[PDB]
Structures are given as structure tokens and as C-alpha cells.
Amino acid sequence: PRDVRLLHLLLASQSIHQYEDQVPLQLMDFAHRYTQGVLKDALVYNDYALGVEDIRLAIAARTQYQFKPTAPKELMLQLAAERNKKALPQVMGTWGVRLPPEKYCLTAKEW
Amino acid sequence: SASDLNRIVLEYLNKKGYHRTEAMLRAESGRTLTPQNKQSPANTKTGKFPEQSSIPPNPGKTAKPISNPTPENYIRAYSMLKNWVDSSLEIYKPELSYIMYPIFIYLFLNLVAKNPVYARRFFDRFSPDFKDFHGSEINRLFSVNSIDHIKENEVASAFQSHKYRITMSKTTLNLLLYFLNENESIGGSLIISVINQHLDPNIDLKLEIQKVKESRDAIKLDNLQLALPSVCMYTFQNTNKDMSCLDFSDDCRIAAAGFQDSYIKIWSLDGSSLNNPNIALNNNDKDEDPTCKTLVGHSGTVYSTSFSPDNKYLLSGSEDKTVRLWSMDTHTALVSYKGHNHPVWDVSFSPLGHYFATASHDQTARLWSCDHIYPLRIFAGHLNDVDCVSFHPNGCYVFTGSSDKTCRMWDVSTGDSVRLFLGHTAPVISIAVCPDGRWLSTGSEDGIINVWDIGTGKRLKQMRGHGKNAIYSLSYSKEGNVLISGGADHTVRVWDLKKATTEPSAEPDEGDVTASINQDIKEYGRRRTVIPTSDLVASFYTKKTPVFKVKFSRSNLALAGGAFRP
Amino acid sequence: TAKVRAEICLKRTELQEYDISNAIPDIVYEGVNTKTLDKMEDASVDRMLQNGIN
Amino acid sequence: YTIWSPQDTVKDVAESLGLENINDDVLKALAMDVEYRILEIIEQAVKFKRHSKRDVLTTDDVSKALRVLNVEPLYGYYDGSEVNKAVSFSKVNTSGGQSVYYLDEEEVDFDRLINEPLPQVPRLPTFTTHWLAVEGVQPAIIQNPNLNDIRVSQPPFIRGAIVTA
């Protein structure tokens, strides 16, 4: 197929020279489902009001819950600053590994 | 575009409130290298142990790396000498059996005057060994617990006046002096002060210790030369590409390998029993023990695994969003540690075993503690996810490398990043900091190692001998700087860290045939071949098994480890 | 060995067991790689030897 | 454009919905975003490949870049006798003005799937140790390589620079 060897060139363009056989098949069956869902939601959003801003609405509807979020460094910095307010607790000074209390450990449990 | 960055830096300092002289001096401080600390791994003469004071670490009360230069209680300072004379049934055994008594008596009588409860520890710790040799005198020394209790016991009060005589040979006196000079700050000087002020050796003593120190100074090794290590390779056979990164313990008795089907496999590397009977011997020889124990607590694939320096606990990080703790002497799980929402990729204990740091897919590293279920610090500030994690050898900074071609040094208390090291071109995959502590080394997935110094933050040099491939592990020489890199191109390579720097590290005075002709063959092409740095010296190939782990032991013997691939 | 040891002792003042450089140490335990194959084969023959029970 | 499809792949899903004619700006921007999402799957796949200590990109390395990126799972890419690259790209062309490949598959009975014997299972893992080096040279036991057939086997970008002490 044209897109199996186009995926071969895409994988080789990012320096991936060893892979299995069903990996471009999995990429094509991902891209089919993603484009079909995006175009169905865009047909809904065009019956509501095709065009490119319609596609933008349909791919901003589902960016919000599945793929990798964008610029998450400042929210993570805020969250880190909320966690790094508390100073560190007192540690043992007997040069070993101390466990939690016995109810917070996976031992006093039953089947 | 770097002069414009220099101008942006100067205007930033001018608007953020640095005087012109102050900004010039901070620039000149930023440019010069971190100088040499002569007590670099804290040699046991002028070096001290860390305090066990039950507080967490704090990198404050501390001057800059740019500027030039750089109580010890009686029970450990006596137990040093006790174990040193106890490790010998040699020709010099009963002379130490003679001289072990009055040093204990004088340490006890000098410690009752300062701390009574430490003295009550010290008396009953070393009591029942020479009771049959010295009679009821230790029973007479039961009732001494204060300064006024010394006036009750007439022989204890006489021990200040009557200096205890001992007739000692010259070889035994020189053996004791050259043992208690080679480690002063453990307590050797504290033993020497009691010997000088309270004993009567038959054969001045201060001139003798001066001659001991001067003759010990007359012959040392100033600038060390390189040494090529011996590598012992552990090859695992019947793992059908489903064995992730493994680790060896310290004493090299246990190996831990994380599988893709949610087991931890535990191998006794000595062929031992690994059943921990402990004399109970109840039942169950009906089971099959192939000197190997399996640990089933995870529900995802184990991507990392780390051993405690105590070597009694194992810490396994998986792709189910927990890190679990295992006891290596009953082979069960103890604690689950839930603070991540993405897979865990690199767990690593502290130097002192206090608290472990973790790497995960959520672009943040997390600091933990083995007694707390939930994290203590969040290390956020990377652009991509964190791949490797490692502490400074004092347990006071954290080093994280990430897939956005950079790594960072984090303050362990305030949480915020102190250093950002730029210059790589690939995901940083393994990081390691030298036992000196002034130099950081890491390897990427481009097959290029490089070293920075933590004071300047810029690059000293790089290392260009591995194939254009991953550098899976990294290890350091115990005393000195020789880097051992076990990567993905089936080789284990050896690197001199001190070639192109201001420290040349004692090159030989006077040629080869194989040198500079091996990569002058270049049959595959100049642009399609690697050209090694002048720092690479040797490279041991493994014949079709890759090396997941390099672990340099204490005695110039490294261990490599990996799985036989086809 | 009377010829080679004279040359060695004349060389040092400047089979065999005192060539110092070419010696490999010994491991406390190495794993099985060939004995377990024949062990599995004569164990399968032993499972044939038990009068035809699978 | 970019390298996924001008119209030749995305438009044949646009027609699968029922949508007859749409402009090429729509297909350009849509296919650009679709192969950006493909690269976004591929990068987490090579991250899982690197941290699984491997060199190929198996089908369970992209199937774990799905759970991370919350994508609904692509079932049916793992079968019996899971070998490395179990060859199954037999896609059959069908003619026309353009090309159409439809992935023929042979039907099978159930009673030749229940009356089918079980495969071979290997041994459980063991280890075996030797000396890779004793003083910085290699002792040339059977377990060591030959260092001259390392030239004729691997190119110097997957084996690195050979130097010896």
C-alpha cells in the first residue's frame, strides 16, 4: 500500500529503522478512526452553524481529554510550589530503612 | 546569537538589581572552573562521617564552589580497634589480647567524667569477654557512674596516679602507631591521646608520632595513573526479550531482574539456598527451589529496580502507578507507594538509604521516604518526561535527566532547580556523578557521553566512542576517575575523565601499532563511521548480548549484566 | 621444565603456574549451559523409562 | 502539504461517512493534524521501546503509547506464537483508476481451532557468568568475540569504535 511505505518513510524520517510489520497497520487503523470521528463531529458542527474552523472546533473538542496536554510546565510548577511549601520531616538517624506504621503496610491483611 | 544572549543577561542583571562591580564579579565567578578539593572522597585521615542527628538535609550554611579551599564518641572509636585486633589469629594475636584491656579501662574512666549513659553503654557492651582474664575487677567497676563515684573505687582513683605500665615490642608499637595514624578522624587520634597521656610504654612519645607521620608522608602516591578494570559479565539466557533493566546488590550476592509480565526475579549469584531457613526447618522440601525466587506484587511491567545500601530491601518501580518495597529475607511485599499517575521509569535510593527519588512519564520527579506512603517533594521544570534519576553522593542534591536533551540539579529541601545543563542532542538516559562530586557525567541515546562541572555548569569535554545508539548504564571508579559505560552496542567501554582538562592524571613517559589505525581503516566511509575521542582507552565487546548494567565493585572489579538476546 | 625455568629466572632479575600476566581467576558459581540439555533429555528418557505413563 | 495524504487517504474516510465534496484546505489541515497525532503516538512508543530495553518497535510498544495518550485500544494485533515480526502484511491490490488494498483473510472452522495442539514452551530463565576482561584485554574463551568478525557483522554506527589496550 502507498501509506504502508509512506509510514515506512515517516518512521525512517525520525530514525526508527527496526520495527515489526503490524505497526504501520496499527498507525493506519488509528488514523482512520481519528479522522472519522473528527469529520463526524465536524459535520455536526457544520450542520449547527465544510470549513477549516469547523475542523478546528472538532479537534479542540477532543484534545481536551485524550492526548498530551500543551505547555503543562507552569501548572506543574504551581503544583510543585504547593507541595514544596512543607519542610521535610524528621528522618531516622540509625542508618537504615524505616517502614511506615503497620496498618499502612501490606502485611496485616487477610484472605 | 550568543552575544545578544550576553546582552540580555547583562540587562537582566541590571534590572534585577546587581551592581556593575557585583555583576562583573559574578560573571568572573561563573567563568572559572571548580578547583580541586584534596579531600575529595573524604579520605579517612582528615574526613568525617555524616552526623546522625535525625534532621533532614539542607544545602545552606555553605560558601561558593569557586573560592579556593575546602564529639566522635568513644564506643565506635574503641570498636574500630576491637575489630582490627579481632580479625587476626596471627602471630601478633596475644600481644593485642594483652594491650586491649587498659585502653578500654582508661576510655571508660575518661568517659564517666563527661557522659554517664554513654559510659553505661560502653561498659556493658564490651564486658563479658575478659571477665575470666581480669577477675572481679569489672565487678568492682559496676558501682562507678559519676565523678564522685570514682573517689569510691580506690583503684579507679589510683588509675589517674598509677600510669598503667606495658612492656611492648618495637614491631607491635610501630604496628599500633601506623594503624592509628592511617585513620585519625575515626577515633585513632582519640586513642592516641589516651595512649600518650595515660599509659606507660616500655621499649618521649610525641617525637615518635612525629617520626611516624613524617615517614608516612615521605612515601605516598601523589598523582594517580589509570588502571584497566576486570569485568565479570552475567549473561541471562532464556529471557525472550521480556527482561527489562536489572541490578546487582552490594556484596554481589543477589541479582534482581524486572520482567515484562509483572514479576521480579531474584537470583542468588553464588548458587546459595536463598530460602532463609534461620534454623526453623519446619517443612516444604516438596517445592522446587532452583536457587531463585519470584516476586508477584505488580500489575504492570517493571521498568526499574533499585537495591538499598543495607541490601535487605528491594524497590521495584512498575508501569502500574506504584513503587513497591520487598523484603529480601522473607520474599514478600511490604509497602506500596502511590504518588504517580503515569508509569515509573527510574527509582533510586539515597546514598545513606534515607529516602528514594523517582522518575516518571509525567515530566516530574518525586522525592519520597521509605516510611511515608505519599511523596515529599515534586521536582517539576522539565519539558519532556524524566528518564534517569540519581543523587549527589552526600544525598543533598538530586540529578534528573529528561528526554528534552537536558538534565537538572535540584535542591532536595526547597525543591527548585539549581542547575540546568544544556548541550546534548538526544534523550539523556543514564546519569552519574563522580565520588569527588565536582563533575557530572551523563550519556544520551546518541552514543555520546559528556562531563560538566557543577560549579561553572558548562562543558569540560565529551566522549565519542560508543555507537549511535543508547548508553544504558554508567559506573565510576571507586577511588579516582575512570568511567565504565555499558551501552546498547554490546560493548563495555573505559574512559579517562582527566585527559583534556587542567588535570592530566599522570601520563606515561614514553607508542603502539594498533593505535590510530583501527579507525583509519574506515572501509564504511568517513562520514558513516565513528571517530573516538582521545579519552577512550578500551572497549570489551560481549558477542550479541547487550549490557543493561555496569556495577563497579570496591576492588577494581566491575560487573556487567545483560540478557542473551537471540 | 629445566630449560624454560632457567630462562624465566634469568629474565626476572632485571602447564606453567608462574606466568603472572596470563592468568584468569575462578568464579564461585557459573550457570549451567550444556549439562541441563542432556539432563532434560535423559529425564525425558526416564519419563519413557517409567513404563509408559504420561 | 505534509507527507501523510493530500486527499488519497483522508478523503476515502470522508467518503466513508457520506460527505461528498469538501475543499482541499480542509483535507490539508486535517491530514497535517492527523499525522501530527501519529508522530505523537510514535514518540511515546519510542520512549516505551527505550525503557523496555529493546531495539525494535514492537506492537506492544505502540499499544502502551495508547493507554498513556488515552486513545481507545486497537485490539487484534497479537496472536498465537508471538515471534518477532510475525509476518502479516499480505495486503492485496484491487484495480481502478487508483489503488485499493483490502487485507485478505482466510476463514477457518472452530473444530480446527479447538482440536489444534499446543506450542512449545522454552525453559525458565537462568544465568551464566564468565570473564569479559581480566586486566583490560579479553581472554578469548568461547564466550568472547573475535574482534575481527565484528567488522563484517555490524556497521560502525551500531557497534562503535574498536580500540583495544
The whole-angstrom separation of Cα B469 and Cα B462 is 16
Is B237–C29 a contact, with Cβ atoms under 8 angstroms apart? no
The whole-angstrom separation of Cα D29 and Cα D1 is 8
Do B75 and B120 form a contact (C-beta atoms < 8 A)? no
Beta bridge partners of B398: B391, B410
Return the residue matching grid coordinates 606507660.
Answer: B200
The whole-angstrom separation of Cα A53 and Cα B238 is 55
The whole-angstrom separation of Cα B57 and Cα B396 is 6
E-strand stretches of B4-102: none
Strand B357-360 relative to strand B364-369, pairing: antiparallel
Distance of CA D153 to the CA centre of its chain: 23
Residue boundaries of the structural domains of chain A: 1-111
Q: Contacts by B515-521 with C-beta closer than 8 Å and gap 24+?
A: B515/D163, B518/D161, B518/D162, B518/D163, B518/D164, B519/D161, B519/D162, B519/D163
- Is B233 an interface residue toward D (CB < 8 Å)? yes
Return the residue matching grid coordinates 502485611.
Answer: A107
What are C47's three cell numbers? Answer: 519419563
Nearest CA in chain D to B304: D51
Do B378 and B417 form a contact (C-beta atoms < 8 A)? no
Where does residue C38 rank: exposed (0-12), middle (13-18), buried (19+ CB within 10 A)? exposed
The whole-angstrom separation of Cα A33 and Cα A25 is 12
Return the residue matching grid coordinates 598523582.
Answer: B223
Q: CB-hemisphere CA count at 13 Å for B52?
A: 11
Distance of CA B343 to the CA centre of its chain: 28
Strand B449-453 relative to strand B439-444, pairing: antiparallel
Among the partner residues C25, C28, C33, nearest to B270 by beta-carbon distance: C28
The whole-angstrom separation of Cα B7 and Cα B16 is 14
Describe the strand order of the beta sheet including B475-476 as a list of residue ranges.
B475-476, B482-486, B491-496, B536-541
CA angle centred on B496, ends B491 and B501, rounded to 5°:
140
Do B395 and B383 form a contact (C-beta atoms < 8 A)? no
What are B164's three cell numbers? Answer: 598503667
What are B442's three cell numbers? Answer: 551523563
Dihedral sign for Cα atoms in the order B363, B367, B369, B375: negative
What are B157's three cell numbers? Answer: 582513683
Do D80 and D119 form a contact (C-beta atoms < 8 A)? yes
Radius of gyration, alpha carbons of chain C: 24
Return the residue matching grid coordinates 546488590.
Answer: B249
- Is A96 an interface residue toward B (CB < 8 Å)? yes
Strand B292-295 relative to strand B536-541, pairing: unpaired
Is B229–D136 a contact, with Cβ atoms under 8 angstroms apart? yes
Interface of A with D (CB under 8 A): 1-4, 6-7, 9-11, 13-14, 16, 18-23, 25-27, 29-36, 38-40, 43, 50-52, 55, 59, 65-68
- Is C15 an interface residue toward B (CB < 8 Å)? no
Name the residue among B325, B248, B267 with its Cα closest to residue B552. B248
The whole-angstrom separation of Cα B10 and Cα B14 is 6
Where does residue B487 rank: exposed (0-12), middle (13-18), buried (19+ CB within 10 A)? buried
Over the range B386-406, which residues count as b (16 or more CB within 10 Å of their CB) and which as e?
Answer: bbbbbbbbebbbbbbbbbebb
The whole-angstrom separation of Cα B326 and Cα B304 is 14
Do D74 and D64 form a contact (C-beta atoms < 8 A)? no
Three-state secondary-structure class, residue B552: strand
Return the residue matching grid coordinates 538534565.
Answer: B407
| DSSP 8-state class, residue D8 | T
Q: Which residues of B touch C31 (CB under 8 A)?
A: 237
The whole-angstrom separation of Cα B361 and Cα B357 is 14
Q: Which residues of C touch B271 (CB under 8 A)?
A: 28-29
Q: CB-hemisphere CA count at 13 Å for B482?
A: 24
What are C46's three cell numbers? Answer: 526416564
Return the residue matching grid coordinates 579479553.
Answer: D138
Nearest CA in chain C to D133: C24
- DSSP letter string over B444-485? ETTS-EEEEETTT-SEEEEE--S-SS-----EE-SSS-EEEE
Is D158–B468 a contact, with Cβ atoms under 8 angstroms apart? yes
| DSSP 8-state class, residue B186 | I
The whole-angstrom separation of Cα B235 and Cα B560 is 9
Phi then psi for C44, rounded to 5 degrees?
-70, -35
What kind and span of H or E run contains B303? Answer: strand B302-307
Nearest CA in chain B to C31: B271
In the stretch 193-232 of chain B, residues with CB closer than 8 A to chain C read: 230, 232
- Give whole-number Cα distances, B257 to B188, B303, D37, in Å: 42, 10, 34
Among the partner residues A14, A19, A40, nearest to D56 by beta-carbon distance: A19
Suggest the residue from A6, A7, A17, A22 to mutate for an interface test with chain D (most D CBs closer than 10 A). Answer: A22
- Is B271 an interface residue toward C (CB < 8 Å)? yes
Return the residue matching grid coordinates 568517659.
Answer: B111
Residue B248, Ramachandran bin (φ over 0: left; ψ between -120 and 50: alpha; else beta): beta
Is D77–A32 a contact, with Cβ atoms under 8 angstroms apart? no
What's the N-to-C CA distance of chain B in angstroms?
Answer: 49
Q: Which residues of D touch C54 (CB under 8 A)?
A: none
Three-state secondary-structure class, residue B220: coil
| DSSP 8-state class, residue B292 | E
- Count of CB atoms within 10 A of residue B432's CB? 20
The whole-angstrom separation of Cα B450 and Cα B457 is 12
Which residue stretches of D11-165 are H helix?
11-17, 24-51, 59-62, 64-68, 111-114
Where does residue B175 rank: exposed (0-12), middle (13-18), buried (19+ CB within 10 A)? middle
Is B542–D132 a contact, with Cβ atoms under 8 angstroms apart? yes
| 3-state DSSP of D105-121 | CCCCCCHHHHCCCCCCC
Do B472 and B547 form a contact (C-beta atoms < 8 A)? yes
> In this complex, does chain A touch chain C, defined as having at least 3 beta-carbon pairs under 8 Å apart?
no
Q: Contacts by B503-506 with C-beta closer than 8 Å and gap 24+?
A: B503/B36, B505/B223, B505/B224, B505/B225, B505/B226, B505/B481, B506/B223, B506/B224, B506/B225
Residue B268, Ramachandran bin (φ over 0: left; ψ between -120 and 50: alpha; else beta): beta
Name the residue among D47, A90, D150, D140 with its Cα closest to residue B354. A90
Return the residue matching grid coordinates 509512506.
Answer: A6
Q: Which residues of B touch C32 (CB under 8 A)?
A: none
The whole-angstrom separation of Cα B92 and Cα B178 is 15
User: D touches which chains (3+ CB pairs under 8 A)?
Assistant: A, B, C
D50 vs chain C: nearest CA distance in angstroms? 28
Name the residue among B445, B404, D36 with its Cα closest to residue A73. B404
The whole-angstrom separation of Cα B149 and Cα B162 is 18
What kind and span of H or E run contains A12? Answer: helix A2-13
What are D74's three cell numbers? Answer: 486497537
Do B141 and B152 form a contact (C-beta atoms < 8 A)? no
Nearest CA in chain B to D158: B467
- Is A111 an interface residue toward B (CB < 8 Å)? no
A/D interface, count of CB pairs below 8 Å: 129
Q: Which residues of D touch B301 (CB under 8 A)?
A: 52
Beta bridge partners of D127: B236
The size of chain D, in residues, is 165
Name the residue among D70, D64, D44, D36 with its Cα closest to residue A66. D70
Q: CB-hemisphere CA count at 13 Å for B403?
A: 18
Among the partner residues B230, B237, B269, nearest to C29 by beta-carbon distance: B269
The size of chain C, in residues, is 54
What are C15's three cell numbers? Answer: 602447564
Q: Which residues of A touch D55 (CB under 8 A)?
A: 18
Dihedral sign for Cα atoms in the order C19, C25, C30, C33: negative
Three-state secondary-structure class, residue B85: helix
Strand B491-496 relative to strand B397-402, pairing: unpaired
Three-state secondary-structure class, residue B503: coil
Three-state secondary-structure class, residue B368: strand
